[PDB]
Amino acid sequence: GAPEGPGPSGGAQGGSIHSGRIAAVHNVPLSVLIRPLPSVLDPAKVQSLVDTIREDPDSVPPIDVLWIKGAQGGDYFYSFGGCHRYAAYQQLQRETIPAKLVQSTLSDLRVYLGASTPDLQ
Ligand SMILES: Nc1ncnc2c1ncn2[C@@H]1O[C@H](COP(=O)(O)OP(=O)(O)OP(=O)(O)O)[C@@H](O)[C@H]1O
Numbered sequence: 001g002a003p004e005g006p007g008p009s010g011g012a013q014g015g016s017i018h019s020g021r022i023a024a025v026h027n028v029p030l031s032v033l034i035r036p037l038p039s040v041l042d043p044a045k046v047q048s049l050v051d052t053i054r055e056d057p058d059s060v061p062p063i064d065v066l067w068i069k070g071a072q073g074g075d076y077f078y079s080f081g082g083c084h085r086y087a088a089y090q091q092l093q094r095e096t097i098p099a100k101l102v103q104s105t106l107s108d109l110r111v112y113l114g115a116s117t118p119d120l121q
């Protein structure tokens with residue numbers, strides 16, 4: 001749980017390209033991925049990816065993922081794409097998946113779900 005926090009000490013949100021920020025590749029757990037948009041997966045195309053990760057996990061780049069926080073610091077990870085890439089990782093029963101984190105705002109989520117957008121907390 002986390003019924004407490006530090007405090008304000010740096011305008012991170014709306015920060016210009018000189019304030020402070022760290023965006024890089026990160027292994028985000030598969031159990032905390034948010035995907036509210038089903039898709040049609042192909043069993044032959046997943047096999048090709050499952051073969052790359054099993055034959056060479058270095059020639060496989062990360063996917064783009066949006067990093068947004070709720071009204072209570074609750075971090076939520078949204079993914080839109082790499083659908084087939086998720087099946088290969090999910091099929092290999094792996095614990096986490098490489099994904100590029102990109103700080104975003106609830107507005108960016110409205111562009112994708114400007115209708116079924118929930119209330120993050
Ligand atoms: N054996 C392989 N089979 C298919 N794609 C491969 C293979 N090895 C490398 N790749 C790369 O994996 C990437 C697959 O993910 P990408 O995000 O690019 O596109 P996508 O097919 O639209 O699907 P999703 O968003 O569902 O993963 C491709 O860009 C391709 O270049």
Ligand SMILES: [Mg+2]
Nearest residue numbers: 080081082083
């Ligand atoms: Mg495409």
